[PDB]
């Protein structure tokens, strides 16, 4: 029909009642430009659409509507790596075209087949603090919690690039037997960021390794929400049909959450805690549910979402929600970054509750998990002692505390300090970790089972 | 007197550290977190009345 | 953890207390260190 | 029958409804999605459709089933996995080639494929029967009949026809009831709306031991059979971990696990782990699972399944209690259930309360807990059962004042904590005594004293030690360890040891092994003994250093004791714990003079 | 055309508005006030009218301008003071006897009295010409590159009429273009809606700095064109100074100054001062003002102009980027642009997010940052130009934890921490090495190493030395400076020279606050050679007192380094530094032995 | 309370009525009126919450002609553990003093665990026999 | 009026009292208006605001609150009696005020401190140790001081 009105990202159509929910419609501007949207609400003889593309210039009887008569599905192909796409279901970059062999829905249940069997295969990042203290699995979800003084993009790229070199070393070990694929999606970040990422992937290896979805900040909030959904379709097909392990790097996850926030402000929808939607739980879930092993059980989708915290607080709604849902927490610290530690990952609150699922034992040691717990415990004591060193001085602290202050310093500067291309095998990391444990005496290492301490020291 | 001064300085060095490192960020975190929750109750009400 | 109503009144006066107290403890330390340097020299003599 | 007027978000408005009950189950559209009637405005009934909608047309058909969202209670609930909207998940895998629910599937409530062996009751022809009576029984497990076939509540009469011993299917008739002619036939399953609690004979006092098998609960604040519990905490809290332990060790004859909107990998883990691991009272083929039924739901899976989870599960529990079983129901988390409501209040356009969660929250939680407790089973044989509810919640960023946690705490009588600092050092779950209480503690100690342990006397000193430890720690921080007295040093050490050896359930070889109330008691005898003898010693003149280095071996032994399997002399008193008692005695004396 | 339905506040709704776009410029009433349609409900268009809707009865006519609200891009920008939606303030002073624009007074965006000399390009009639290709140019400057006239972006065709060389007015046509009949006429300016980003050939990352001419910017963490940067606010006792100095000392081709919503004391100061001050590269004709184009809004100006302020400035910056020029956008302050959003929201009835600031805030900032950056300019022979945004973000809650600051820093890659105590004492600029960072460091340091400086070695070392000095200063307070080695004392001695010369610069003198990028590198060279040599010499047998007497003359020179002239033979190689190096090596043999 | 008025006034009984738990009453007030014209006050708790309260306090007090009395001891649970919250706050203005419990004693193990510093009755001197 | 009476009455209570004070002021009598507590009166306006179906914008208290609290208070003062015979009357309002938002920076307390000229304090913590009224010097001010102290100097006290 024709546009009735427009109030923000919501468009009021006066139409007829034949449309179905999320059925595509195309808005024909008087310029003769077509932009796409999907109906968010349908009522009798009228619709509310949210348009992906644009949010202004929308007329009345000079404008027209046309129905596509297909509710939105993403055209998925398995020849997607190396190929350049834009976050809009097609490239607007003029990159190699998407093609379709299935079109798969982004609602969060197309044909979805996931974990009835939990991850047991270890996948390494080449970084000790990640791998040893928390571990990463063939379905693991780990949030990178970052800040406005940390460089989020440099760490994001760091984890991805080094996990591509380690992952074939692990294929030979028989941790794997199937392909590796990267799906990189950037949604609504700066130009400066976008360019940087592509440059990073090229240096380490190639861009044949990865598939790229690029979405620009100048493009709307409505576009931004569809951008990860496009990533999900890509990854699920690859795992399902061609038994490939898929690694998704989703940047920026915070970018996506602010978008949700905008479609409740310029909607009449009342928001929940701290101005973030009440139905914010469901929006976030959609990304995280579509993870784990994929049917055949040689395919998988593994997630590393990248969150930048704006206030850097742990009372902000985004970091909290994400944490309950995700299988691990990786906290990256501004204070380490300042001191000259790269990567500057603080493990004080990094925790996995699904620690068993995260570790490996058939392509990693059984001792891996036992040592990690002890290390974490001994790091924590070393932090309690650090605060006490400032207050009390060395004028009353105990013999035991002194060992813990030394351990803390040796631990930051050796374990967490690694070259920009220097990759550590998980077995070598144990040897490093054992050096860290070795200064404490056999009565301070009392919590650990006697069997392990007498065996390996 | 000199032995007496040495004993007192140690209590005094301890306090100067103690205030800065513990007390001041404990006050900051409590005040700001309660401020933020308190304003939220008030704002949502306005939105519900309006709706 | 803590009240969500009028923690601001007790907390505000604490915060001020702390920074005010800190400044003051620094002057008392400065005086104690001031005398200390002097007596160390006088005692060796 | 009805015709869709509008779909605005997951909310659908359909005209041509002359009726419909509250929360009536419908199949909406040609797709046949789940719904319930929340409200009616005019002739147009607003029905929320809670299975994901990306393609429902206006003027699609609306079919009323004619009764509310309900559950089947009948044979083959055990070792059979279901959703919160009672669809068998296994049935879906085979048919659909969609391991999880895809958009638009309609699979019946039970398995009508598995024949079951029916034997007749003490009620033969011409005998009166009434709801909740044992009309018969069905063999389900290798050791016991799980599902006692009950006449449903709100049915009555005399039995004209009793089917004989043999195999039958679920939809075939097996019972005929006389009261105003053929009142109806009955089938093996019976139905019940899940917003109605099941009626009991009487509720009975809660004062009987509930052994959850975890050292840390037994030591500090045990639960009771009939219990209600709140547990907070936020990721790295060990809640999945304590569920798995809880299912293995649990003395209850049924455990019902409720996944409210879980990772999916978490559900995949617990499912695999029950048949991989062995039970403590023995279990032949899928050992732990024989006692376990799963209601599992993931984070984006239907909002109805997630909302109904606590009611589907509590109804199951009440039915097992009417059967005469002791039930331990674990729900994890009620907070994820609370998000389902936050979402419901926005969509409908009803006004919510604080934090954008509605005000009806408080009633709905309270209703769930009150149906729990220990009771005398409804039905003529008469038995004793319990439903002891352990309900997990999550703080909003360290804020325990969020409506969900405060509400649950309102209703509970037992509170068990969770401390973030202590989890970082790996001590989860982390329960102290300034974030936790139990009203059952007083009666519970009286019952344990009887059974053998000295527990009440040791419990009081144990509480004190922790309570003083916290306060003494604040002085170490600020003033330094230079303001302490020697007895206060003692309180600090014993405390650090307690923190590790009960609260930590983290491995170092193997995740820790079944520790009973008896085991837990021995640990307490050794820690409390250490503290008394040491303080005497310092009081009476002696070095701190001499005393701590000397305890040494004994400390390593208690740490690792829990990894070793129970019984090492006996369960009651181990030889390993018995011997330390002598060592302390020998040390105390060397020290004094 | 439309008829006014309601005037409720400054919001006016009008009926009978068809083919009304959603950014449509409209003129309300008989008076012709400026307004723009934010929303449309039905037949009725909801307009925010920026000027007083006093005297406007219901029934006045509403006349569409027939196109969105646009800004004009073309000759005669420089040396003009403008509104937030580009309206010459200067022209109102001539006519009205007013500084400001009062209600019912609108005028065109570019002056039509002024005529400029149009010179044709390299294309003639019958040539096909494409979007952005250089059709001609205007020359009216001699100090900087002028206004090179492009064919309007997203416009193609064959040129029917190319006007020959001669003076034409801005209003008057100089082009007709053949593209499906007569495409339209075009004029010397082009209109572009400002809430749409201007295209360029492609955008690139930044890599290319230019003369900042303030030593501290280059030295502590380099200043780059095509950058994203946060500078703290101060409300005109510190904010004003750094802004005035950045405009004056930076010899970037253009500078576009935007005052979003300022005190009015600051607006008053920037306009009077620009012709008065001298260029730092030579030339008269109102020195700095000739390079400057100003958008100057006090908070008193209409709220849509305050919101619009940055958008119009950014389009301006983007236009000059296609000519191939390096631009500094100096915007002050985003907190004040943000304040406008908050106001406009409450008037509409929009529900905001945290602290009363909308949710349009975070996406509008992200969109804004990306328009700014480095790009290869559009137009056939291609050049490189840049747009560098330095945006101040002031207090908006009395802290920097408010939504505007916290959002921006995140997208931003650079923070420069002004120091209040030093600022109140009138050292400008005085950037703190503790709070500050640049994530541009790496790529840039490699760029200067290419060009000729030893820059990576010196910058990194500059930072370490100062960080190290805070930590050694604490050892002097508590233990004493006398028990510490000569080496440590030296680490501090050098840090004090680095602090005095660079950081404590006075923007009230030009032999103390203007030196080229090479000159700034030569000074820093001088201090580093001394640090190493001083530590080397004390190790081989020297003392702090001995060292100080011995270095003498070179130490005095380095102290006196800032007072020296921008040249000595060249402004790129300062001969006095190159010879200083020799005097240092000769001094080190003498001192050490 | 109506039943208490019958006994106190007609047959001259001293009535002690215990009304537990006022928190459940307060909650009920919030949930209703989410679908009437009347629309809740401060933090989603009714502004007319005070009117409700006052209807309970109405049938309490001394009775005319001195046939009997009704004395009332309500039990309120502070849900956030602060008295600056609505349930203690409105109720406290009506009431003639308050007796507030103690969290700290409880942990120690004391019973009854109240404290005396926040507890004050103003009409103490004049009331007593 | 007790709380138990109709909120319509409680709303009116204060008005009845000030008109009686004012009549008596006009009689040429000196009158004490003693009111306890205005916050309960404010709570009464709030009970009516939710029932009528108004829009509060002051923490659940009506927007109208500020104009009604002020208008009422301005009726007290010393004045020359209404009428020809000429007499002097006064109404002194001694008003208790109390929290109502639970804060001390809630609207009720904000409006009242602005309109008043005299404030004498009271602290709850010191009051418990039993020393009521336990005046806070810092929150206390008086505008009346100069004219009143001049008067007292004439009366004999060296007070000031």
From Swiss-Prot, chain A:
Residues that coordinate or bind ATP: 353
* Gene3D superfamilies xref list: 3.40.50.12240
Listed GO MF terms: ATP binding; proton-transporting ATPase activity, rotational mechanism
Q: How does it sit in the membrane?
A: Peripheral membrane protein
Keyword list (alphabetical) reads: ATP-binding, Hydrogen ion transport, Ion transport, Isopeptide bond, Membrane, Nucleotide-binding, Phosphoprotein, Transport, Ubl conjugation, Vacuole
Does the record bear Signal in its keywords? no
Q: Which GO terms are recorded in the biological process aspect for this UniProt protein?
A: ATP metabolic process; endosomal lumen acidification; Golgi lumen acidification; intracellular calcium ion homeostasis; pexophagy; proteasome storage granule assembly; proton transmembrane transport; transmembrane transport
Q: What's one GO-annotated cellular component?
A: proton-transporting V-type ATPase complex
Q: Indicate yes or no for the key word Phosphoprotein.
A: yes
Q: Which InterPro entries does this one have?
A: ATP-synt_VA_C, ATPase_a/bsu_AS, ATPase_F1/V1/A1_a/bsu_N, ATPase_F1/V1/A1_a/bsu_nucl-bd, ATPase_V1-cplx_bsu, P-loop_NTPase, V-ATPase_su_B/beta
Which of the residues bear the PTM Phosphoserine?
109
Localization: Vacuole membrane
Matching entries from PANTHER family are given as: V-TYPE PROTON ATPASE SUBUNIT B
Quaternary context: V-ATPase is a heteromultimeric enzyme composed of a peripheral catalytic V1 complex (components A to H) attached to an integral membrane V0 proton pore complex (components: a, c, c', c'', d, e, f and VOA1). Interacts with RAV1 and RAV2 components of the RAVE complex, which are essential for the stability and assembly of V-ATPase.
Provide the function of this protein.
Non-catalytic subunit of the V1 complex of vacuolar(H+)-ATPase (V-ATPase), a multisubunit enzyme composed of a peripheral complex (V1) that hydrolyzes ATP and a membrane integral complex (V0) that translocates protons. V-ATPase is responsible for acidifying and maintaining the pH of intracellular compartments.
- What's in the misc comment field? Present with 131000 molecules/cell in log phase SD medium.
> What family name appears in the similarity comment?
Belongs to the ATPase alpha/beta chains family.
Report what the protein is called.
V-type proton ATPase subunit B
Q: Which gene encodes it?
A: VMA2
Curated annotation (Swiss-Prot), chain B:
Q: Which organism is it from?
A: Saccharomyces cerevisiae (strain ATCC 204508 / S288c) (Baker's yeast)
Spell out the note in the miscellaneous section.
Present with 8500 molecules/cell in log phase SD medium.
Q: Where in the cell is it found?
A: Vacuole membrane
In the record, the note on similarity to other proteins reads:
Belongs to the V-ATPase D subunit family.
Q: What is this protein called?
A: V-type proton ATPase subunit D
Please spell out the taxonomic lineage of the organism that makes this protein.
Eukaryota, Fungi, Dikarya, Ascomycota, Saccharomycotina
Indicate the quaternary assembly.
Answer: V-ATPase is a heteromultimeric enzyme composed of a peripheral catalytic V1 complex (components A to H) attached to an integral membrane V0 proton pore complex (components: a, c, c', c'', d, e, f and VOA1). Interacts with RAV1 and RAV2 components of the RAVE complex, which are essential for the stability and assembly of V-ATPase.
First and last residue shown, out of the full length, are 155 to 205 of 256
Protein's job: Subunit of the V1 complex of vacuolar(H+)-ATPase (V-ATPase), a multisubunit enzyme composed of a peripheral complex (V1) that hydrolyzes ATP and a membrane integral complex (V0) that translocates protons. V-ATPase is responsible for acidifying and maintaining the pH of intracellular compartments.
Superkingdom of the organism of origin: Eukaryota
